[PDB]
């Protein structure tokens, strides 16, 4: 929520915000507040099986959300609807490319460096954005 670029700390303001590690078992867990048990009210000696029914259904709607519908758009999409980018005021992803950065090793050639190697990563790349129609004044931002 940082109001101004001055509410930003040393590292961030200069280098950009941090992002998430590539998804794996520990870097992409289930939202921490994930329900691990759903309690349902019971009388003292009886249980409304018809209620227990709704109970589950209700839980469902809750999980569906927790798991993958935390954003409004996702909820709507869930019903089989749509949402303009103007609906939840979201940047419009115009283009997204990616690649693996490879390179080569430089060999050591002097008395002590001979047999040593330094890696010089160095990958070329294109990032093309198809003609795009800009409906309203704004900004086209490209980040890496």
């Amino acid at each position: 929520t940082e109001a101004n670029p001055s509410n930003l700390n040393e590292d961030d303001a200069r280098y950009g915000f941090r992002c998430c590690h590539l998804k794996n078992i520990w870097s992409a867990p289930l939202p921490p507040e994930t329900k691990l048990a759903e309690e349902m009210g019971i009388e003292s000696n009886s249980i409304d099986i018809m209620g227990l029914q709704a109970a589950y259904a209700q839980l469902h709607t809750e999980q569906e959300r927790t798991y993958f519908m935390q954003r409004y758009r996702d909820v709507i999409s869930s019903f089989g609807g749509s949402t303009s980018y103007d609906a939840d005021n979201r940047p419009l992803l115009v283009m997204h490319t990616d690649f693996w950065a490879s390179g080569y090793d430089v060999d050591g050639t002097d008395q002590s460096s001979l047999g040593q190697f330094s890696g010089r990563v160095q990958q070329t790349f294109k990032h093309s954005v198809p003609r795009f129609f800009v409906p309203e004044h704004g900004v086209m931002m490209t980040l890496a």
Binding site: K23, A28, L30, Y67, M69
Partner: peptide, 26 residues
């Protein structure tokens, strides 16, 4: 025995979904 000159390894990358986190995360 493969001829080529040693290449650095890339991505650890399939079937259906694995990571549910609430929505899209890059």
């Amino acid at each position: 025995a493969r001829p080529g000159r040693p290449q650095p390894l890339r991505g650890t990358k399939k079937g259906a979904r694995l990571w549910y986190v609430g929505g899209q995360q890059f």
